[PDB]
Every structure is written in C-alpha cells, then in structure tokens.
C-alpha cells in the first residue's frame, strides 16, 4: 500500500525526479493537519459498533425485503455475515484515512468485491446503500464539535466521505 507520502514518491520515482519545492510544501501542510486526521480515525474506531448497527437499522428499514424470509439477509448466519461486511468495509476505510491514501482500501478490500457478490447473489446495490448509511453515521460522529478543540475539519471530512463513496461505487 501507499500512504500520502509514498504516493507522491512513487510518481516522482517513475519519472526519475526529486520532489519539487511545491510538493514538499504540500506534504508539509498535510503534516499540519495531522491531528484532525488522527482524531477522525480515533472517533470512527471508537464508535464502530454503533456506526454499523445504526446504519444496519436504517438500511433494513428502507429495504425490508432483505430481511423477510427468502431475503439475502434473512437467517442469523446471513445477517451476521452482512454485519460483518459492513464492519470490514468500515475498518478498511479507517486504514485509508489513517494513511491518507485509498490504495489499502482498494487492494485489500474493494478489488474484486463486485464479482464476489455477483457470484454469491448478494445485492450489491443494497450493500452500497448500507455503505452510504455508515458514511452519514460516521461523519456526524467525526465532525461533532463536542469534547474536541475547535477548528475547520472540512477537508479531512471530505476525504473520508471520498473513501466511503469509493466503497459504495465499487459494488453498486
């Protein structure tokens, strides 16, 4: 996987060039935002269970056909499997937020996920809706003004939303 720093390095190496002054300054500015990034990872991580369950509730409320007899998510083992997928995706989204690069999420989670669901008969479009639900729940927790030093977290919040949206699109 790449992190925000090595992503730049790989692009520079593949060209045989040193990082330009502006690229070094861009990375420096990323370092300045460090605390906001780590807070986001800490807050989503510390609220993982609540984020998955609340998103799961909303999902099944809007798509009741998934949980009625015959539904892909009917029965304990399938429901548990579905809940587990939600958590897996969330876990990998925190890894990407932590490193500042989508590679880990793409390579170790999303790659081939659409094909896997199609073979199992899992409704991908419904998974995507679940991911969107987790985004809403997770971002409200991330951007909660209480118990945290005041500041503008717009950019990091946008970046995280991007990882969730990438996850939803990968299976929708």
Partner 1 sequence: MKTPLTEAVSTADSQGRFLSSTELQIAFGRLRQANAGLQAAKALTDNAQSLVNGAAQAVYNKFPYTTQTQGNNFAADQRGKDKCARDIGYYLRIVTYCLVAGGTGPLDEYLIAGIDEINRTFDLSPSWYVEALKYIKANHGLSGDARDEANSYLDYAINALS
Ligand X SMILES: *[C@H](C)[C@H]1/C(=C/c2[nH]c(/C=C3N=C(/C=C4\NC(=O)C(CC)=C4C)C(C)=C\3CCC(=O)O)c(CCC(=O)O)c2C)NC(=O)[C@@H]1C
- Angle between helical axes of 34-46 and 76-99 (0-180°, round to 10): 170
Site membership for ligand X, residue 19 (CB under 6 A): no
Spatial neighbors of 111 by CB under 8 A, at least 6 apart, are: none
Which tokens is 112 given? 């081939």
Site membership for partner 1, residue 19 (CB under 8 A): yes
**Three-state DSSP string of 59-109:** HHHHCHHHCCCCCCCCCHHHHHHHHHHHHHHHHHHHHHHHHCCCHHHHHHH
When CB distances are held under 5 to 8 angstroms depending on the partner's kind, the choice from a second copy, ligand X, partner 1, none that residue 70 binds is: a second copy
Q: How far apart are CA 36 and CA 167, in angstroms?
A: 22
Residue numbers 51-70 binding partner 1 by CB under 8 A: 52-53, 56-57
Candidates 22, 28, 32, 70; binder of a second copy (CB under 8 A) is: 70
Q: How many angstroms separate the first and last alpha carbons of the chain?
A: 24
CB of residue 84 vs partner 1: minimum separation in angstroms?
A: 8
For residue 19, what is the DSSP state? P
CB of residue 65 vs partner 1: minimum separation in angstroms?
A: 15
- The residue among 49 and 68 lying less far from a second copy, judged by its C-beta, is 68
For residues 118 and 126, is the Cβ–Cβ distance under 8 A? no
Candidates 16, 21, 112, 121; binder of a second copy (CB under 8 A) is: 16
Check whether 109 is labelled as a binding-site residue.
Answer: no
In this structure, the number of other CB atoms found within 10 A of the CB of residue 103 comes to 16
CB of residue 125 vs ligand X: minimum separation in angstroms?
A: 8
Site membership for partner 1, residue 154 (CB under 8 A): no
CB of residue 100 vs ligand X: minimum separation in angstroms?
A: 14
Feature table: binding site for (2R,3E)-phycocyanobilin: 82, 153
- Name the site residues for ligand X (rule: CB under 6 A): 35-36, 38-40, 42, 57, 60, 66-67, 72-76, 78-79, 81-82, 85-86, 88, 108-109, 113, 116, 120, 122-123, 126-127, 130, 142-145, 148-151, 153
């Amino acid at each position: 996987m790449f992190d925000v720093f090595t992503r730049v390095v790989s692009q520079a190496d593949a060209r045989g060039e040193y990082l330009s002054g502006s690229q070094l300054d861009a990375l420096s500015a990323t370092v300045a935002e460090g605390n906001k990034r780590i807070d986001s990872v800490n807050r989503i991580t510390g609220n993982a269970s609540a984020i998955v369950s609340n998103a799961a509730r909303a999902l099944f409320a809007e798509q009741p056909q998934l949980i009625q007899p015959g539904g892909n998510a009917y029965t304990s083992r399938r429901m548990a499997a579905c809940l587990r997928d939600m958590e897996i995706i969330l876990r990998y989204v925190t890894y990407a937020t932590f490193t500042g690069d989508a590679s880990v999420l793409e390579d170790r989670c999303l790659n081939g996920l659409r094909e896997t669901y199609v073979a199992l008969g899992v409704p991908g479009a419904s998974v995507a809706a679940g991911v969107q639900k987790m985004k809403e729940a997770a971002l409200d927790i991330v951007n909660d003004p209480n118990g945290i030093t005041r500041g503008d977290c717009s950019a990091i919040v946008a970046e995280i939303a991007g990882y969730f949206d990438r996850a939803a699109a990968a299976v929708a």
